[PDB]
Short mmCIF file of C-alpha atoms in Angstrom, two decimals:
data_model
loop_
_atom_site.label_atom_id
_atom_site.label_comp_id
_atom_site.label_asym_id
_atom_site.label_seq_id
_atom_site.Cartn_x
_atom_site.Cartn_y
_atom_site.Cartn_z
CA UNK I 1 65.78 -75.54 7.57
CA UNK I 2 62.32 -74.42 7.52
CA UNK I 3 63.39 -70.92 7.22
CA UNK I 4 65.65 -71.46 4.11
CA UNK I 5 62.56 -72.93 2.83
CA UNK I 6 60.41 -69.83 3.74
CA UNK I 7 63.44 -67.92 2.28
CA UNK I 8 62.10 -68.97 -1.26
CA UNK I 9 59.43 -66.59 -0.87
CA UNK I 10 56.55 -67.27 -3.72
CA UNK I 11 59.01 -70.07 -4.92
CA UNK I 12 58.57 -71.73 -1.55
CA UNK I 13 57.26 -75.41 -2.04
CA UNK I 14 53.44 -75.86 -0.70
CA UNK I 15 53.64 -76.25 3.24
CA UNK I 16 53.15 -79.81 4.90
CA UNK I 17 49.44 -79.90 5.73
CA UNK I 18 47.63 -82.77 7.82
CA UNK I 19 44.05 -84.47 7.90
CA UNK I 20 41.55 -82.90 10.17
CA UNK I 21 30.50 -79.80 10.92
CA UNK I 22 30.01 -80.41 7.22
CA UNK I 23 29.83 -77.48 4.79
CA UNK I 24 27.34 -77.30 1.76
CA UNK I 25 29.46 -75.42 -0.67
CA UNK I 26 33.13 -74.55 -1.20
CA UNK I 27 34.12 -71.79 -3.19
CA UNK I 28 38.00 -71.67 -4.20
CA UNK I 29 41.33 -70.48 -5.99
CA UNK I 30 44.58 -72.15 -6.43
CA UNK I 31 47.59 -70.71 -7.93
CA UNK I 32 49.28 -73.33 -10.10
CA UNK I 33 51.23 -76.31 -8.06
CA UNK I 34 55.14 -76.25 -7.96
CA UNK I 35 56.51 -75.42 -11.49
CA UNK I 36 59.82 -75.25 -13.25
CA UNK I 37 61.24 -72.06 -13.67
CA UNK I 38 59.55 -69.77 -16.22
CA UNK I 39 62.76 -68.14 -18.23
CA UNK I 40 66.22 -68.96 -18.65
CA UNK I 41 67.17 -65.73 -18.26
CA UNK I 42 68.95 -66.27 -14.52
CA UNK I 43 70.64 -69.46 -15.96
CA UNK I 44 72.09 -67.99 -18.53
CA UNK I 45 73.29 -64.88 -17.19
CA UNK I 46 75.14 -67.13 -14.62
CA UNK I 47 76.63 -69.48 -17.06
CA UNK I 48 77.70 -66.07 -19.19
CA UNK I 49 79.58 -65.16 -16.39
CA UNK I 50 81.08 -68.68 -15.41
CA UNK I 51 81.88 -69.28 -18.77
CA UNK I 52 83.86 -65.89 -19.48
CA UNK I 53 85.79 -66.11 -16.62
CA UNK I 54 87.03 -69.63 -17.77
CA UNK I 55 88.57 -67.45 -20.31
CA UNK I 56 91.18 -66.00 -18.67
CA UNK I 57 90.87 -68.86 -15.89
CA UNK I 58 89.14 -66.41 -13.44
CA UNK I 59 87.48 -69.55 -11.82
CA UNK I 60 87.66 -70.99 -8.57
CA UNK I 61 87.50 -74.62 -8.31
CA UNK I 62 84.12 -74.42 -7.27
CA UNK I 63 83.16 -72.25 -9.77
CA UNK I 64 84.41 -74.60 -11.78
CA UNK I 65 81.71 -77.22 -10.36
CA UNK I 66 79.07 -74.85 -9.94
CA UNK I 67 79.93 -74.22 -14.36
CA UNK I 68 79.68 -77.68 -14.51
CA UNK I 69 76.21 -77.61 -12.53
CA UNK I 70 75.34 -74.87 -14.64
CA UNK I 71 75.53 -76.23 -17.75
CA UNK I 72 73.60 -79.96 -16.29
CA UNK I 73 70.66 -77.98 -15.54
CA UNK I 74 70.19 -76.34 -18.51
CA UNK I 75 70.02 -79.60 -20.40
CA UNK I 76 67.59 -80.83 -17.98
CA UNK I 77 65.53 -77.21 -17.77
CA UNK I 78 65.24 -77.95 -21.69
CA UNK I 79 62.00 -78.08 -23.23
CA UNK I 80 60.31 -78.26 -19.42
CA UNK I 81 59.77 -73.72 -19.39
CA UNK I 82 57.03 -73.17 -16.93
CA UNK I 83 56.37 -76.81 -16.35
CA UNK I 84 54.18 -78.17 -13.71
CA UNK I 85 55.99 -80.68 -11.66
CA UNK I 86 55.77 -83.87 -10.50
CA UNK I 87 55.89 -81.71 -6.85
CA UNK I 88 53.66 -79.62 -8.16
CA UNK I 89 51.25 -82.33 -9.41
CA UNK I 90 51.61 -84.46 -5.60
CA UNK I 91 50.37 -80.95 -4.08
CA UNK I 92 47.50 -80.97 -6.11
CA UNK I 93 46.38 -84.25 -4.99
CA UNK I 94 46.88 -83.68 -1.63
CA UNK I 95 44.89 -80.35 -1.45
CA UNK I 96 42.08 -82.44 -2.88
CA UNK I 97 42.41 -85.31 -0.98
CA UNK I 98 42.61 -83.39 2.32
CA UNK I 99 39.56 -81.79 1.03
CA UNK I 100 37.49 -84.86 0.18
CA UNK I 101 38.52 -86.55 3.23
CA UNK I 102 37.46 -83.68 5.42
CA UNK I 103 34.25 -82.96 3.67
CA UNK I 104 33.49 -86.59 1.78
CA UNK I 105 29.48 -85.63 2.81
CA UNK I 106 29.49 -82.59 -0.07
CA UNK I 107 31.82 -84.83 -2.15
CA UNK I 108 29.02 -87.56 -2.37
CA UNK I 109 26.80 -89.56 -4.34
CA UNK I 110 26.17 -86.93 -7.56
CA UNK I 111 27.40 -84.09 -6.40
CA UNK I 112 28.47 -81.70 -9.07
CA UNK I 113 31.75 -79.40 -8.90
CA UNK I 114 32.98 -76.76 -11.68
CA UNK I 115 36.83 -76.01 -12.17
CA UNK I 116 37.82 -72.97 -14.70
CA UNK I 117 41.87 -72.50 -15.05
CA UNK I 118 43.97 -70.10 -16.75
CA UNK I 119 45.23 -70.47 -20.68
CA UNK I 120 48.43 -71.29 -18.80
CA UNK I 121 49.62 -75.16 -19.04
CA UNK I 122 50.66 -75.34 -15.43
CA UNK I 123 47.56 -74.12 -14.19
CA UNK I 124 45.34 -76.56 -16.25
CA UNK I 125 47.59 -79.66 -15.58
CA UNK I 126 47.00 -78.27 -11.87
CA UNK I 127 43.58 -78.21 -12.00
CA UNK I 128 43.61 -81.82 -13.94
CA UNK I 129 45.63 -83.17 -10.84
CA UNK I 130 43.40 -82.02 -8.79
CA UNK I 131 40.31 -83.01 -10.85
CA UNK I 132 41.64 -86.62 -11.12
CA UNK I 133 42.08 -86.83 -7.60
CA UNK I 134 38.57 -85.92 -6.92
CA UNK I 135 37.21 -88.14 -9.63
CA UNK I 136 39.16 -90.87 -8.35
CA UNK I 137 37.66 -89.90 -4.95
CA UNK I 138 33.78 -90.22 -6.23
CA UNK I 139 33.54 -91.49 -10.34
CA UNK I 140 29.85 -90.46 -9.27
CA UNK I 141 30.79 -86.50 -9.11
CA UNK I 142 29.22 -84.44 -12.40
CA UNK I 143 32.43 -82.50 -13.64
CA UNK I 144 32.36 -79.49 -15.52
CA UNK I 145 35.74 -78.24 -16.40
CA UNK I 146 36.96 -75.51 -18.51
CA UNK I 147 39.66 -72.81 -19.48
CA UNK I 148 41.22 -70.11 -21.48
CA UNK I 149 41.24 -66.93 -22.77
CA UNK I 150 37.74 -66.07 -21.54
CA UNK I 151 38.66 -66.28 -17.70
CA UNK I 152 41.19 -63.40 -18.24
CA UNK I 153 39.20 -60.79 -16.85
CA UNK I 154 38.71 -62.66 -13.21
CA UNK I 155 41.90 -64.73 -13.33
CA UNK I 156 44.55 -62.91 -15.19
CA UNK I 157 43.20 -58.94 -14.16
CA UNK I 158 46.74 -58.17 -13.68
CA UNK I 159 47.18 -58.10 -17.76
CA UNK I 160 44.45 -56.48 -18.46
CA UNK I 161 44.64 -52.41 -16.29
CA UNK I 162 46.81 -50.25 -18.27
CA UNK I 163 47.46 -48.61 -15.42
CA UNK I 164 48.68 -51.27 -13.20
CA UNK I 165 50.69 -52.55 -16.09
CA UNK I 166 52.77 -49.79 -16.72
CA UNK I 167 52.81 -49.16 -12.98
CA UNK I 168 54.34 -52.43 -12.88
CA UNK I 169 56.96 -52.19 -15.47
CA UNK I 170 57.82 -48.44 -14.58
CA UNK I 171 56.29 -47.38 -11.54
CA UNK I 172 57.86 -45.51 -8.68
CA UNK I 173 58.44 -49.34 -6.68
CA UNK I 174 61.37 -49.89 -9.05
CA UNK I 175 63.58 -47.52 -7.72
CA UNK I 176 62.98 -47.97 -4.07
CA UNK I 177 63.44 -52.23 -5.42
CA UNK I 178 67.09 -51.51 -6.77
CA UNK I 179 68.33 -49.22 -3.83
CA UNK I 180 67.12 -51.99 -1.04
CA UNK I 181 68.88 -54.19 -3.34
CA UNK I 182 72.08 -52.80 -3.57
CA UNK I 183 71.43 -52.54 0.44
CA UNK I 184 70.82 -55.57 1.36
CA UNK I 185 72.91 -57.95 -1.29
CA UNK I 186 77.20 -57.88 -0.65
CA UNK I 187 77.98 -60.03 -3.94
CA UNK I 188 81.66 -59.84 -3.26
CA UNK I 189 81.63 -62.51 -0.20
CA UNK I 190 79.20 -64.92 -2.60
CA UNK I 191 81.73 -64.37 -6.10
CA UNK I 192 84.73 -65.25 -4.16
CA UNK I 193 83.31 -68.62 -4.07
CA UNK I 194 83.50 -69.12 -7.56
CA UNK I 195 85.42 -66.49 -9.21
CA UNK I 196 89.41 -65.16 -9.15
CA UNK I 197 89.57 -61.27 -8.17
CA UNK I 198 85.86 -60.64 -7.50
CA UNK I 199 86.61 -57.52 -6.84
CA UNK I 200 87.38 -56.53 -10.62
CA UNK I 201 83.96 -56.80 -11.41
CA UNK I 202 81.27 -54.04 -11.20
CA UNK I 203 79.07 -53.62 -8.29
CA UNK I 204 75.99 -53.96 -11.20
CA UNK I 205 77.26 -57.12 -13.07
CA UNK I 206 77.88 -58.53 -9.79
CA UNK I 207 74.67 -57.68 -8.06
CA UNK I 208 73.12 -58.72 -11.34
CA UNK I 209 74.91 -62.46 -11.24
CA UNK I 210 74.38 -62.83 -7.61
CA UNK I 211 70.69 -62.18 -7.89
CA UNK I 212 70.59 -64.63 -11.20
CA UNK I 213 72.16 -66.94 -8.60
CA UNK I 214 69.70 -66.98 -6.03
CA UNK I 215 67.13 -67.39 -8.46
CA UNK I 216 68.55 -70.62 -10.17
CA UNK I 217 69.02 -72.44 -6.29
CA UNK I 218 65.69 -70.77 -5.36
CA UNK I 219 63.68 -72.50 -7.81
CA UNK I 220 65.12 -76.41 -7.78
CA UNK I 221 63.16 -77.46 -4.92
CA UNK I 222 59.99 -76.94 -7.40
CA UNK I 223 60.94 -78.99 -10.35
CA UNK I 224 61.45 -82.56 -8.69
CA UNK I 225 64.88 -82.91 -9.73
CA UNK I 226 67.10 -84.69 -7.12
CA UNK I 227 69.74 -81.54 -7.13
CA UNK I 228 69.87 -78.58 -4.52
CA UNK I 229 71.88 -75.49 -4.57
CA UNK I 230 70.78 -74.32 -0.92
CA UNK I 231 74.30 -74.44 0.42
CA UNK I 232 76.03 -72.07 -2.13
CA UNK I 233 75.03 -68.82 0.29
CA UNK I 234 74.76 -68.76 3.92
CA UNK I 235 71.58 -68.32 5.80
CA UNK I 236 72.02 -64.59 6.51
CA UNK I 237 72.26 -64.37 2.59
CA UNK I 238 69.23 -66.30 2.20
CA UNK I 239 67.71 -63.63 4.46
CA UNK I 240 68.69 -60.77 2.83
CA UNK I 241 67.66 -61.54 -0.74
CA UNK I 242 64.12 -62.99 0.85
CA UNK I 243 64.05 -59.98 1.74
CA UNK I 244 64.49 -58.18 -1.34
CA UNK I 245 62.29 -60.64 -3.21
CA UNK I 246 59.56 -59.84 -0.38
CA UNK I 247 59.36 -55.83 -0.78
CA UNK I 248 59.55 -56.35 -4.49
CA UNK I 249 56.27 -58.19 -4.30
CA UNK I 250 54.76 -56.48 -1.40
CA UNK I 251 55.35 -52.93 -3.41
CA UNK I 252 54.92 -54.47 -7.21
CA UNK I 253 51.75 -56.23 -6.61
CA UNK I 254 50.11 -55.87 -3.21
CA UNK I 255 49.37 -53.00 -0.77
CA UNK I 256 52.49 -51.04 -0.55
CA UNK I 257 51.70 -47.14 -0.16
CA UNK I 258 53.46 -46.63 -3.10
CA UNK I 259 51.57 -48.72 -5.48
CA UNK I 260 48.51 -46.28 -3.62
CA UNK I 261 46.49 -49.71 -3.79
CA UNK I 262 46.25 -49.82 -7.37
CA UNK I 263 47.87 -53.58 -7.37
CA UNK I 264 45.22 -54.72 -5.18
CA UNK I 265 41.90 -53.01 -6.62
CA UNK I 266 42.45 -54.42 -10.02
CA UNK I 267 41.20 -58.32 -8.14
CA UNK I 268 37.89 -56.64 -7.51
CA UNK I 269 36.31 -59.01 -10.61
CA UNK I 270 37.54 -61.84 -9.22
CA UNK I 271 35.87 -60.77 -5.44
CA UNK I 272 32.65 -60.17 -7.46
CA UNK I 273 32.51 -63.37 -8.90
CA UNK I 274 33.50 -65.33 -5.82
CA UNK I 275 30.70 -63.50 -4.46
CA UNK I 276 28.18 -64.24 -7.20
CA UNK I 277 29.13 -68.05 -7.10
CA UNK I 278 28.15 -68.30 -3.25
CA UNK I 279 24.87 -65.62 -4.22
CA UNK I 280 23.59 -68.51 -6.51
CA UNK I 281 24.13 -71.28 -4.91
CA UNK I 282 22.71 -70.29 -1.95
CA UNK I 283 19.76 -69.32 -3.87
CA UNK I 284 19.26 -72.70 -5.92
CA UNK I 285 19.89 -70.67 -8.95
CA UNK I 286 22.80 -73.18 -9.22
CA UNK I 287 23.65 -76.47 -7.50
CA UNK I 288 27.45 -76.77 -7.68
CA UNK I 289 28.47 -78.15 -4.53
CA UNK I 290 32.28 -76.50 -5.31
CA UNK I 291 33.39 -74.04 -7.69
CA UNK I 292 37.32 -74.09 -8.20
CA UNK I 293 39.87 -71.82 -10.45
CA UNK I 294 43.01 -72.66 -11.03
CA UNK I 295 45.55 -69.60 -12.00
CA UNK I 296 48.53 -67.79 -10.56
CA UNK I 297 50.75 -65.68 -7.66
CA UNK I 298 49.25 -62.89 -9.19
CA UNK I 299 45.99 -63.41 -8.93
CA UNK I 300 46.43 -65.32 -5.52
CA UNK I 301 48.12 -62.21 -4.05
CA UNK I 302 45.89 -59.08 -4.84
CA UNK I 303 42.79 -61.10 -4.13
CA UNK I 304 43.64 -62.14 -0.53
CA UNK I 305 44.88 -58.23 0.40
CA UNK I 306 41.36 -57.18 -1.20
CA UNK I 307 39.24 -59.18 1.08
CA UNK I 308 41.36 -57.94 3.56
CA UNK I 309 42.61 -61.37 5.37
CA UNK I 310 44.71 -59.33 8.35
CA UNK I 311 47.78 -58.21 7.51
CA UNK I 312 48.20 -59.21 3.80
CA UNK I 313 46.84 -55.52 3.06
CA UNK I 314 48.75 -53.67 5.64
CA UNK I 315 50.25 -50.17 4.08
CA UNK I 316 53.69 -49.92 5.17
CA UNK I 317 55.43 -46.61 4.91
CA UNK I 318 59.06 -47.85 5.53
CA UNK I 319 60.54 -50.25 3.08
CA UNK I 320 62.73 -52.12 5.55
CA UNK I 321 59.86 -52.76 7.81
CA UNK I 322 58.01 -54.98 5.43
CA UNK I 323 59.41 -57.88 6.05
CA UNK I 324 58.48 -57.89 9.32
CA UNK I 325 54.68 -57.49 8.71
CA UNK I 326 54.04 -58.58 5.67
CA UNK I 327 55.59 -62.38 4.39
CA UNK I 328 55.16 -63.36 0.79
CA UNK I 329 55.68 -67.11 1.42
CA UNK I 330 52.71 -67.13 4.19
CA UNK I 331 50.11 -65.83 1.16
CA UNK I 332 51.33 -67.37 -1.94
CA UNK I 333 53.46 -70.22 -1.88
CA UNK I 334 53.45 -72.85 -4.78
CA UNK I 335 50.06 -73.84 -5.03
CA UNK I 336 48.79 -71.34 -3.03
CA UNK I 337 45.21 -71.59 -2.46
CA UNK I 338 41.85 -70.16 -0.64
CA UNK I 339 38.98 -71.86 0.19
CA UNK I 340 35.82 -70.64 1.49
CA UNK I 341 33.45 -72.84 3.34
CA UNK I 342 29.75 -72.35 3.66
CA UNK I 343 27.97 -73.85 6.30
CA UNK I 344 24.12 -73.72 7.41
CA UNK I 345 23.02 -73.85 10.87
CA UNK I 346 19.88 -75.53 12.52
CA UNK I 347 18.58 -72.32 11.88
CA UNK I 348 19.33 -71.76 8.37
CA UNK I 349 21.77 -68.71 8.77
CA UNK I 350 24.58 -69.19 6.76
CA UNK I 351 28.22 -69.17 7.95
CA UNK I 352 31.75 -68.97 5.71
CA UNK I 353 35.32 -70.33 7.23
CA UNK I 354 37.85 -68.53 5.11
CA UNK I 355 41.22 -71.09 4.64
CA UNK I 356 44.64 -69.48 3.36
CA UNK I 357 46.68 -72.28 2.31
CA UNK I 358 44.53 -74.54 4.51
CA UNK I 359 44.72 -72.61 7.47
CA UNK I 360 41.41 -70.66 9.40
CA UNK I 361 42.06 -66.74 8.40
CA UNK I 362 40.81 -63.21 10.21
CA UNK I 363 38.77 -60.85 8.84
CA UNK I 364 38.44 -56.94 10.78
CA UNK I 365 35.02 -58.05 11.32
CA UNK I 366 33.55 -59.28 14.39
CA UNK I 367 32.48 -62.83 15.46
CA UNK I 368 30.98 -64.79 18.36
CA UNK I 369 32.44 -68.21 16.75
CA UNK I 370 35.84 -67.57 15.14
CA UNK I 371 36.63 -68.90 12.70
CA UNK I 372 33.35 -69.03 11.34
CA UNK I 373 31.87 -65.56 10.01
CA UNK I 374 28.27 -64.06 9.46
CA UNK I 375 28.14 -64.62 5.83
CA UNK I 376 26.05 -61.68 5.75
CA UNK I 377 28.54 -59.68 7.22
CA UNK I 378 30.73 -60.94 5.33
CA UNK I 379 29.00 -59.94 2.21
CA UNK I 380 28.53 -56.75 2.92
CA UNK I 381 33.09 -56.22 4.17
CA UNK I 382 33.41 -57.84 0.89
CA UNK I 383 30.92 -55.74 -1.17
CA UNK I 384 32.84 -52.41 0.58
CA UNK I 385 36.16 -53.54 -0.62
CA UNK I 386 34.66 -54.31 -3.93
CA UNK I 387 33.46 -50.37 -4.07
CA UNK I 388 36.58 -48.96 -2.16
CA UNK I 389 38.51 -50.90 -5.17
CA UNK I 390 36.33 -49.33 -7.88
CA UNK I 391 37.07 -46.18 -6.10
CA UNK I 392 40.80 -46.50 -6.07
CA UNK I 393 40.66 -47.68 -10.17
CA UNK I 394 38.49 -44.29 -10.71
CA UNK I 395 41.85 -42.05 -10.43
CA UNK I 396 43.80 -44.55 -12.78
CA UNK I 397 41.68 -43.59 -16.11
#
């Protein structure tokens, strides 16, 4: 059961963490906690198709039921689009709680922390759940907190390259997306579930209900509602359309060759500024003890394969091998996050702990001390990815 839960890919609910030197300053991004789904597209396509064929009684008995589910969870989907959840609220606190118990020494007496989030409501009410927490965890913390439009350019990048936008809406990933599709997804074992004569419908409007399907059951585990739709498809099904929700990811907004890294160079503002933060506070030209951001998979995604973390920037030339190096659900769950932690020695050099999701991560750089890192070092990796980015964005007007 925890790989049907990994099957969920970026829908996948935040991963069970546990409790357990002091650092001086954390510097941080969190994609929006667990979240109703964003469009009723999916629903409604499958409720079309449930509906019609009870015209004509082309239903099963349980397509009957699953009509009947259908139609209950678009009532309770109703005027909650996009929502955070009360999931995706409890992850919140417990990424901040984890964090103040760990660290309760930069946490204390007046220590002052900055948050900046997306225009997007699930991002702010995520970075107001975690915010609470905190304050609840030190009323003496100085709190600056902010959002909006003017964060765009280092939190919502993805919007704002031409390029990358129409490389993501027409791009040459979408074809190589449908055919591993129509590979990989059998929708006539799945419809005879549900539906009379499966086999009268068209390989596309079955693919395309199938794949609405999936969506609907992969997304209930994030809205908190005591309903799950796991058991409509069998593991290996599970499997296979992780898998197609993986490569469309990996090749629509990370380091596939045939996105030619032009999904990952557009993060390089957000690398800057994460680098800029650190700059000034180590400098006492500011004297924020943590600077968080609160946004999205899309920013969470490029950003980790730009500062290279191994493996989420690999460049794999054959679509079916992605899967097998490159997991969506391992970099951006709900409420994916990254921390980096700043520590000083005894003799004032300055070392940074990079945490995916909590968890110690690799750089190709060398160190004496993993998991801690030469923050010079890593300064300078950082600062070459930066420029290799600007590079790569030189081609694309």
């Amino acid at each position: 059961q925890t790989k049907i839960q990994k099957y969920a890919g970026t829908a996948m609910p935040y991963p069970n963490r546990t409790d357990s030197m002091t650092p001086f300053y954390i510097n941080h991004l969190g994609r929006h906690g667990a979240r109703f789904p964003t469009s009723r597209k999916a629903l409604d396509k499958v409720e079309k198709v449930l509906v019609s064929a009870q015209q004509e009684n082309g239903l099963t008995s349980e397509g009957m039921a699953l009509l009947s589910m259908i139609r209950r969870l678009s009532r309770l989907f109703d005027g909650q689009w996009g929502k955070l959840s009360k999931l995706g609220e409890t992850e919140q606190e417990g990424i901040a709680g984890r964090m103040i118990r760990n660290y309760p020494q930069l946490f204390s007496n007046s220590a002052k922390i900055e948050a900046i989030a997306t225009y997007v409501p699930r991002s702010i009410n995520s970075m107001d759940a975690f915010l609470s927490c905190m304050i609840r965890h030190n009323p003496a913390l100085q709190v600056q907190r902010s959002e909006g439009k003017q964060y765009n350019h280092i939190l919502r990048f993805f919007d704002l390259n031409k390029s990358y936008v129409n490389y993501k809406e027409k791009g040459d990933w979408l074809p190589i997306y449908k055919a591993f599709v129509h590979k990989k997804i059998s929708p006539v074992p799945i419809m005879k579930k549900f539906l009379l004569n499966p086999e009268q419908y068209l390989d596309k409007e079955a693919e395309e209900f199938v794949m609405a399907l999936f969506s609907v059951a992969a997304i209930l585990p994030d809205t908190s509602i005591p309903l799950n739709l796991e058991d409509l498809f069998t593991l290996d099904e599970w499997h296979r359309y992780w898998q197609t929700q993986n490569l469309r990811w990996y090749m629509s907004k990370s380091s596939a060759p045939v996105g030619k890294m032009l999904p990952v160079a557009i993060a390089w503002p957000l690398l800057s500024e994460f680098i800029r933060s650190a700059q000034e506070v180590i400098s006492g030209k500011s004297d924020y003890q943590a600077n968080f951001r609160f946004a999205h998979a899309e920013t969470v995604i490029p950003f980790v394969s730009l500062m290279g973390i191994e493996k989420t920037d690999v460049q794999v030339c054959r679509p079916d091998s992605v899967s097998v190096y490159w997991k969506d659900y391992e970099i951006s769950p709900m409420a994916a996050n990254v921390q980096w932690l700043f520590y000083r020695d005894r003799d004032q050099r300055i070392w940074v702990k990079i945490l995916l999701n909590e968890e110690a991560a690799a750089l190709p750089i060398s160190t004496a001390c993993f998991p801690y890192y030469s923050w010079e070092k890593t300064r300078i990796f950082f600062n070459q990815r930066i420029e290799m980015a600007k590079k790569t964005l030189s081609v694309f007007n």
